[PDB]
Every structure is written in structure tokens, then in C-alpha cells.
């Protein structure tokens, strides 16, 4: 299957992995016989594709909590919405 990197979060299976992360270009030094790397807590952060020495980072898809600002019911009925802790170029692609 063709490889789409950084286009969007995409669940995947390179060789025997759960995946479910967005992919990005990495520059970490990496030994030849090695296959993938776990940063901390045995969580896999970087993997290497068989088609090249190209290594790929893995980042979880963004999530957060939505909060509502309000000046009180009796005064007015406007509100404001704050999507916490997230770069917001994906706000229209929020399911909840």
C-alpha cells in the first residue's frame, strides 16, 4: 500500500505493530540491524520502513477538553468556546 506521511492521522500496520498514529520525518541516529525505537515507558516512538533507511516518528492524534465561557444567563446569551491544549487547524475535524 502506498505510504502517506503527515497527510493526516492514519491507523497502520508496518510489520507487526498496532500503529494508530500520525507519521513524520525523523532524523534520529539508528543502527542498521535495529528496527524500531521506544522513547520512554516502552512506548514506541519511531519505526523504520523496509523500503528505505527512512525512519518515521509517531505522535498520538490530538485530544483535549472543550470548555464554555459565559457572562451569565440573565445578562446575555452569547458564549465562547475554548478547545484546550491543541493547535487549532483541525477544529472543524472535531467529532465531539
Amino acid at each position: 500500500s502506498t505510504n502517506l506521511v503527515k497527510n493526516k492521522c492514519v491507523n497502520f500496520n508496518f510489520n507487526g505493530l498496532t500503529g494508530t498514529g500520525v507519521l513524520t520525518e525523523s532524523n534520529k541516529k539508528f543502527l542498521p540491524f535495529q528496527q524500531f525505537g521506544r522513547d520512554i515507558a516502552d512506548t514506541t516512538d519511531a519505526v523504520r520502513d523496509p523500503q528505505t533507511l527512512e525512519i518515521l516518528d509517531i505522535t498520538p492524534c490530538s485530544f483535549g477538553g472543550v470548555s464554555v465561557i459565559t457572562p451569565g444567563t440573565n445578562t446575555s446569551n452569547q458564549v465562547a468556546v475554548l478547545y484546550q491544549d491543541v493547535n487549532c487547524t483541525e477544529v472543524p475535524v472535531a467529532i465531539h
Binding site: 543502527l31 540491524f33 535495529q34 528496527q35 524500531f36 525505537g37 521506544r38 519511531a46
Partner: peptide, 24 residues
């Protein structure tokens, strides 16, 4: 039979996993 002591030779990469600047 001319016994000898192996000081610090006999270690090998247990897995093809990449780990950087950590103690495991």
C-alpha cells in the same frame, strides 16, 4: 586445565530495539 577468569566479556544486544541515553 588452565582455568581463567572472564572479566567483562560476554554481552550481546538482547533485542533489535533502539534506546538512547537510558539505563535498562
Amino acid at each position: 586445565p588452565a582455568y581463567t577468569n572472564s572479566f567483562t566479556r560476554g554481552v550481546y544486544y538482547p533485542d533489535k530495539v533502539f534506546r538512547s541515553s537510558v539505563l535498562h
